[PDB]
């Protein structure tokens, strides 16, 4: 039983991506202080406890599923698509999300507001003519007051429907007051859609749409995410735990039940001695 660890994560042979102050979802959305993680790839995304959000207050229904699938894909490669939003104002911003000195927003999301004095029924489409899945991250803006709702979206109650040939997903934004977060009582709800090859994405919305700017290229492989504060080191190790890298020569380990790579099986016993010699009978 291997019961001790070096306390550091070896950076080989696996591609380790240390997420400094950034969570995977914040790096996905395009949080300003996460801009260094654009187009990054990883075998293991190490997510630190010091990570925080510093953009528009948002909320992911089924956060764990999105985090799991993004981690499994193992890449943040983002392809910008040409979305034609007619009759609305693109690139909306906020002071809760300060990119540089001025107001900003998530780099992978497009906050569409009314243009002039109208907000038409947006109806856009993108086909998937590639041979890989496309991940689309979109949002719904929940305003704090009806005045804000009608000032951004002329409709008193918008809705956002994102659909493909096989499935659909509709969200009705709600207007209500919420806990103060970075200066705002409003929220963003983050939803995702996977468009399979040979399918089509149709986005039909009449208000409160945080539109996508493109798609994330979905992949399949050995990628995962881990919550650990262990520092990264320059060394070779096949088995990573939140406690650091551990040798895998022993068949069992007692360091941590969370593992990545060629790891020993986790057991509750802290020691198991295997006899490699005869029964010891000393003199006298």
């Amino acid at each position: 039983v291997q019961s001790s660890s070096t306390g550091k994560i070896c950076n080989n042979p696996h591609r380790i991506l240390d997420g400094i102050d950034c969570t995977l979802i914040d790096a996905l959305l395009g949080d300003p202080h996460c801009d260094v993680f654009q187009n990054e790839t990883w075998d293991l995304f190490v997510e630190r406890s010091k990570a925080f959000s510093n953009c528009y207050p948002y909320d992911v229904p089924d956060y764990a599923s999105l985090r799991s699938l993004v981690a499994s894909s193992g890449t943040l490669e983002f392809i910008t698509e040409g979305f034609t939003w007619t009759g609305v104002t693109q690139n909306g911003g906020s002071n809760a999300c300060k990119r540089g000195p001025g107001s900003g927003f998530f780099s992978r999301l497009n906050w569409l507001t009314k243009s002039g004095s109208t907000y038409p029924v947006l109806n856009v489409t993108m086909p998937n003519n590639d041979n890989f899945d496309k991940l689309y991250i979109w949002g719904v803006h929940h305003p704090s007051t009806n005045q804000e709702q009608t000032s951004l979206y002329v409709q008193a109650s918008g809705r956002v429907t994102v659909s493909t040939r096989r499935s659909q997903q509709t969200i009705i934004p709600n207007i209500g007051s919420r806990p103060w977060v970075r200066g705002l009582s409003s929220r963003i709800s983050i939803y995702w859609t996977i468009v399979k090859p040979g399918d089509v994405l149709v986005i039909n919305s009449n208000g409160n749409l945080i539109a996508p700017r493109g798609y994330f290229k979905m992949r399949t492989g050995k990628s995962s995410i881990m919550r650990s504060d262990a520092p990264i080191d320059t060394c070779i190790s096949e088995c990573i735990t939140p406690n650091g890298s551990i040798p895998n020569d022993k068949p069992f380990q007692n360091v941590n039940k969370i593992t990545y790579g060629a790891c020993p099986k986790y057991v509750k016993q802290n020691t198991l001695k295997l006899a490699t010699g005869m029964r010891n009978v000393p003199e006298k």
Partner: antibody, heavy 126, light 97 residues
């Protein structure tokens, strides 16, 4: 900004117990561990101990085992260090300092104390 | 794991200062200005934290770390500690005329 505001000066009597509080601001208390460091007046810094916020496991110097207890109040983002059976040599300025690791490792093995409190002068003698 | 370092480096403003902590076993360097809380100024073993001028530098041999302050002035002069738990003895920085 990140700040650790400590309590006021405590003037105690030998054999009593004292409690020093550290109110953290600008971040979530459970995102970082917290070390407590003593400095006797003009005698250099002395590490007292370490509280792992988010799971409550402690680490104390053997000199302080049994007579020091560190706790946290997540509701108010506060951390408390209580020293029982006070002695004369415990007269010192006590600092709370922010350390990074809480999950997977004990942070003080690998990370520094980047943010410090203003210190409370706990004087137990006259 | 006893840490040691050479105390009471006395010097005028504007030149080299070298402090040497010999770990007997991650060493970080803290500055305590008089009547102020200690401030971290060398993370890792050679890394500088945010807001600390590039004048400060750290260097690690096999078991000896050294902190170098360049062009020191009034605020650079303080009491300096190495940390690895254990602190160093402490070396005072004083101005010289």
């Amino acid at each position: 900004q990140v700040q650790l505001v400590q309590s006021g000066a405590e003037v105690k009597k030998p054999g009593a117990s004292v409690t020093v509080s550290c109110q953290v601001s600008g971040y979530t208390l459970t995102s970082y561990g917290l070390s407590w460091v003593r400095q006797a007046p003009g005698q250099g810094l002395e590490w007292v101990g370490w509280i792992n916020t988010y799971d409550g496991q402690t680490k104390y110097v053997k000199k302080f085992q049994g007579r020091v207890t560190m706790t946290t109040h997540t509701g108010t983002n506060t951390a408390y260090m209580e020293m029982k059976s006070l002695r004369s040599d415990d007269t010192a300025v006590y600092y709370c300092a922010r350390v990074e690791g809480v999950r997977g490792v004990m942070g003080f093995h690998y990370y520094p104390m980047d943010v410090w409190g203003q210190g409370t002068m706990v004087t137990v003698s006259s | 794991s006893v840490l040691t370092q050479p105390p009471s480096v006395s010097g005028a403003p504007g030149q080299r200062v070298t402090i040497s902590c010999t770990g007997s076993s991650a060493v970080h360097w803290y500055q305590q200005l008089p009547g102020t809380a200690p401030k971290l100024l060398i993370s890792g073993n050679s890394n500088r934290p945010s807001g600390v001028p590039d004048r400060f530098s750290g260097s690690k041999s096999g078991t000896s770390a050294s902190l170098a302050i360049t062009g020191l002035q009034a605020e650079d002069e303080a009491d300096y500690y190495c940390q690895s738990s254990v602190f160093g003895g402490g070396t005072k920085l004083t101005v010289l005329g």
